[PDB]
Design a protein around this motif. Structure first.
Motif, PDB file in Angstrom:
ATOM      1  N   UNK A  80       0.733  -1.221  -0.014  1.00 33.66           N
ATOM      2  CA  UNK A  80       0.188  -0.085   0.093  1.00 33.66           C
ATOM      3  C   UNK A  80       0.911   1.168  -0.073  1.00 33.66           C
ATOM      4  N   UNK A  81       0.315   2.409  -0.075  1.00 34.51           N
ATOM      5  CA  UNK A  81       0.860   3.667  -0.319  1.00 34.51           C
ATOM      6  C   UNK A  81       1.383   4.177   1.054  1.00 34.51           C
ATOM      7  N   UNK A  82       2.496   4.645   1.157  1.00 38.56           N
ATOM      8  CA  UNK A  82       3.297   5.342   2.401  1.00 38.56           C
ATOM      9  C   UNK A  82       3.639   4.153   3.503  1.00 38.56           C
ATOM     10  N   UNK A 111       5.691   7.317 -10.922  1.00 34.95           N
ATOM     11  CA  UNK A 111       4.213   7.864 -10.764  1.00 34.95           C
ATOM     12  C   UNK A 111       4.634   8.909  -9.727  1.00 34.95           C
ATOM     13  N   UNK A 112       5.006   8.661  -8.622  1.00 34.48           N
ATOM     14  CA  UNK A 112       4.912   9.576  -7.715  1.00 34.48           C
ATOM     15  C   UNK A 112       6.088  10.461  -7.859  1.00 34.48           C
ATOM     16  N   UNK A 113       5.921  11.690  -7.374  1.00 30.61           N
ATOM     17  CA  UNK A 113       6.829  12.756  -7.662  1.00 30.61           C
ATOM     18  C   UNK A 113       8.276  12.796  -6.940  1.00 30.61           C
ATOM     19  N   UNK A 114       9.443  12.741  -7.631  1.00 30.06           N
ATOM     20  CA  UNK A 114      10.754  12.787  -6.683  1.00 30.06           C
ATOM     21  C   UNK A 114      10.761  11.402  -6.065  1.00 30.06           C
ATOM     22  N   UNK A 117      14.345  10.034  -7.414  1.00 30.71           N
ATOM     23  CA  UNK A 117      15.376  10.735  -6.807  1.00 30.71           C
ATOM     24  C   UNK A 117      15.413  10.630  -5.217  1.00 30.71           C
ATOM     25  N   UNK A 118      14.439  10.183  -4.811  1.00 29.60           N
ATOM     26  CA  UNK A 118      14.388   9.567  -3.340  1.00 29.60           C
ATOM     27  C   UNK A 118      15.315   8.348  -3.333  1.00 29.60           C
ATOM     28  N   UNK A 121      18.846   9.099  -3.785  1.00 31.41           N
ATOM     29  CA  UNK A 121      19.781   9.535  -2.639  1.00 31.41           C
ATOM     30  C   UNK A 121      19.850   8.477  -1.641  1.00 31.41           C
ATOM     31  N   UNK A 164       3.429   2.437  -4.299  1.00 34.60           N
ATOM     32  CA  UNK A 164       2.157   2.053  -3.620  1.00 34.60           C
ATOM     33  C   UNK A 164       1.159   1.869  -4.629  1.00 34.60           C
ATOM     34  N   UNK A 166      -3.183   0.330  -4.507  1.00 36.08           N
ATOM     35  CA  UNK A 166      -4.242  -0.239  -3.702  1.00 36.08           C
ATOM     36  C   UNK A 166      -4.485  -1.623  -4.136  1.00 36.08           C
TER      37      UNK A 166
END
Ligand SMILES: Nc1nc2c(ncn2[C@@H]2O[C@H](COP(=O)(O)OP(=O)(O)CP(=O)(O)O)[C@@H](O)[C@H]2O)c(=O)[nH]1
Ligand SMILES: Nc1nc2c(ncn2[C@@H]2O[C@H](COP(=O)(O)OP(=O)(O)CP(=O)(O)O)[C@@H](O)[C@H]2O)c(=O)[nH]1
Ligand SMILES: [Mg+2]
Ligand SMILES: [Mg+2]
Lengths: 267, 290
Positions: A80-82, A111-114, A117-118, A121, A164, A166
């Motif tokens: 799931x997300x998060x 899909x998710x922004x950055x 890049x996350x 890093x 993430x 559903x």
């Protein structure tokens, strides 16, 4: 005895306090009560039957990561997300790098922004390369290309991060299937938040039925939830929880100890 | 597409009351209401059935809806955003890791901008990898300016201070402040939250006008210790209940409002820019029960 039918409905309350899924609760209370009837001191004995059933349900002993005999070990993360997938990716590389294994991450979240890049890093922090692709190459194709890069560089372990999604999102679950098909992974680990409530049993079941998992990783155990979501994973899917996260640092990845979780759930 | 509560209540007659309410109890537990709230709801329905006040399956379902609507309304303040009268108003977004803080802030900025409100964003998460980059992408999407820390050693409180100062000098209506995820069990990160609130208040009297707690709709009963500690430490003025487009119901939010009096003010219903809805209690309770 059926003076113990009374505290038996008391541990149902306690398990439900602890976010344990109601069908897992029911099978636990009935399974414990049936052993209480035949087993035949009586108070310390019910505590032992309950603690022992929790430990049994959650795997008995630690389950180790299993590695490919002849190629790179390929580990797919989903959830799931998060819940902490991108963090666990780099934690896992940090964890396996300490065992002498060389690693590589795959940035499969487009899909998710950055998000890429996350991951890039975090990879530089733990000192593992991160495979990235251009915009408009889909996740199933970055799985293909990242796996080829891993085999060419004779890497011991590949870890693919995914967005993430559903578990009821048919298109995105279909995309996860395609990623898995092209990865052909050794491990598919569901990342599960220790604060997850009653959906945990249905969540594992849908991921296991539509994707097929080999185990799970439980995150945010430095929280103060009792973690009843842990009790559903092996009971509904047959696969063990293999690792827990308890913090945001790269080192905060540990083996899952069924015994420790049992005491935490009745804590 | 099975409506659980509709279908168990179809079985009701006076003689089936216990068998039906047993089924209703399991249905509420599975929605994350918890045993304490579930027992209260179910026991009040059993008394109103037995006294002959509730006479059909739909009266029971209406009384079920009525009792949760009553708990949601046990607040002391309004569900609307309460910005100040001073410029700019200041809104902080806070909560545990992963709940949806940065996404909700972007979606809220989108709503404010549609209303003509001039919005400035502050990248107060100075810890997590790419947190600024992520908020910057939302800024460009929603047409907002953004304050981002220059260095890696930057403190959340300093970034929000500069942002609220910049919002005052340039006539912004609203400054929206992101903050890094923190567990309510982490004393030094909860302290850092107190420093941000104090820092922003030194620039505009009454700031922050809103401190919105983000609660992940997948979370079970832990929602309540979360809301307790955050509210105790900084004071929560509203809730954002995220990820309700999944299969989680968020039923635990009912006991949060019931115990604490914090209005739910928005719900998250997806990941696109538009997927933030102002809280409508009637819509929420109808949705949670079918
Ligand atoms: N306290 C604590 N925080 C954690 C833990 N694991 C991850 N986090 C934090 O959770 C938050 C979300 O982490 P992230 O790795 O981005 O989650 P994700 O599942 O990849 C989010 P998405 O589904 O969009 O990819 C981060 O702030 C991360 O540092 C943990 O075990 N304990
Ligand atoms: N399906 C769905 N996903 C959501 C919703 N709100 C946020 N998300 C997703 O959850 C994940 C985390 O969102 P994000 O805004 O970064 O959470 P956060 O609280 O800022 C994570 P951190 O604690 O590190 O700051 C993202 O993938 C986001 O798109 C929602 O309402 N529905
Ligand atoms: Mg990601
Ligand atoms: Mg954030």
């Amino acid at each position: 005895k059926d003076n113990i039918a009374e505290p038996m409905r008391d541990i149902r309350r306690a398990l439900l306090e602890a976010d344990v899924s109601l069908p897992v609760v029911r099978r636990f209370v009935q399974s414990v009560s049936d052993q209480a009837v035949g087993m035949g001191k009586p108070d310390q004995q019910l505590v032992k039957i309950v603690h022992d059933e929790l430990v049994k349900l959650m795997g008995g002993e630690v389950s180790e990561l299993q590695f490919a005999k002849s190629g790179p070990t390929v580990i797919l993360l989903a959830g799931l997300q998060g819940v902490g997938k991108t963090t666990v990716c780099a934690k896992l590389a940090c964890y396996l790098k300490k065992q002498g294994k060389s690693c590589m991450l795959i940035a499969g979240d487009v899909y998710r922004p950055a998000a890429i890049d996350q991951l890039v890093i975090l990879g530089e922090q733990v000192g593992v390369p991160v495979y990235t692709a251009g915009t408009d190459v889909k996740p199933a194709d970055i799985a293909k290309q990242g796996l080829k890069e891993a085999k060419k560089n004779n890497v011991d372990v590949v870890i693919m991060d995914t967005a993430g999604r559903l578990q009821i999102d048919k298109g995105m679950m279909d995309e996860l299937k395609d990623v898995k098909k092209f990865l052909n992974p050794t491990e598919v680990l569901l990342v599960v938040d220790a604060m997850t409530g009653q959906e945990a049993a249905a969540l594992v079941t849908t991921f296991n039925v539509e994707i097929g998992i080999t185990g799970a990783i439980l995150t945010k155990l430095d929280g103060d939830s009792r973690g009843g979501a842990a009790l559903s994973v092996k009971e509904v899917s047959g696969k063990p929880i293999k690792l827990v996260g308890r913090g945001e640092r790269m080192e905060d990845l540990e083996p899952f100890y069924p015994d420790r979780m049992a005491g935490r759930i009745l804590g | 597409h099975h409506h659980v509560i509709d279908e168990l209540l179809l079985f009701w007659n006076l003689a089936e009351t216990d068998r039906v309410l047993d089924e209703l109890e399991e249905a509420l537990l599975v929605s994350d209401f918890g045993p304490k709230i579930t027992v209260r709801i179910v026991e009040r329905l059993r008394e109103d059935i037995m006294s002959g006040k509730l006479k059909s399956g739909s009266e029971i379902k209406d009384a079920l809806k009525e009792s949760v609507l009553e708990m949601l309304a046990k607040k002391n303040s309004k569900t609307e955003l309460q910005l100040g009268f001073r410029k700019p108003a200041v809104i902080m977004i806070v909560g545990v890791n992963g709940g949806g803080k940065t996404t909700s802030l972007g979606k809220l900025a989108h709503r404010l901008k549609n209303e003509g409100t001039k919005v400035l964003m502050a990248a107060g998460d100075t810890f997590r990898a790419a947190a600024s980059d992520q908020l910057e992408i939302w800024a460009e999407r929603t047409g907002c300016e953004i304050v981002v820390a220059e260095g890696d050693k930057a403190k959340a409180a300093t970034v929000l201070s500069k942002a609220v100062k910049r919002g005052k000098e340039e006539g912004y209506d609203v400054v929206l402040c992101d903050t890094s995820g923190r567990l309510h069990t982490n004393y030094s990160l909860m302290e850092e939250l107190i420093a941000c609130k104090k820092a922003v208040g030194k620039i505009v009297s009454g700031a922050p006008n809103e401190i919105l707690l983000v609660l992940d709709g997948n979370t079970g009963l832990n929602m309540l210790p979360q809301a307790r500690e955050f509210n105790e430490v900084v004071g929560i003025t509203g809730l954002i209940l995220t990820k309700l487009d999944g299969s989680a119901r968020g039923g635990c939010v009912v006991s949060v409002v019931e115990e604490l009096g914090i209005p739910v003010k928005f719900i998250g219903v997806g990941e696109a820019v538009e997927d933030l809805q102002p809280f409508d209690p009637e819509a929420f309770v109808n949705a949670i029960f079918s």
